[PDB]
């Protein structure tokens, strides 16, 4: 079981889908495809994601046994 | 590239590679190829171990900003 707060953080912050997929080198396809749970990122671009919005990557993806 | 410090933090926890591999359901060869830097895990399998290791993820996988 994974919940994923990337939309909600990236919007708290005020950057579009476009900023951070740019950042990102991804599709902003990609980045919503994330967000709308479709399918999971890698880890490096998972710690990406992290870096650029200045959160620690649990706060974003959160994985619970079961 | 990601550096990763997952032997260190195990070995100092005192908790062999089949030990690992059977909390986390995976093979040992998986926890062996991360280790020898072969193998980046899935990011699942990542969010697995920061949990039952008791490490915030990136202390243990670590992205080189790039």
Redesign the interface.
């Known amino acids: 079981m ?1 919940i994923n707060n990337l939309k909600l953080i990236r919007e708290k912050k005020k950057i579009s889908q476009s900023e951070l997929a740019a950042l990102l080198e991804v599709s902003r396809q990609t980045i919503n495809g994330i967000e709308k749970n479709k399918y ?5 671009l ?3 994601i ?2 650029y919005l200045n959160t ?3 706060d974003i ?5 079961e």
């Open positions: 994974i999971n990122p890698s880890l490096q998972a710690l990406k992290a870096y620690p990557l649990e993806f959160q994985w619970q046994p």
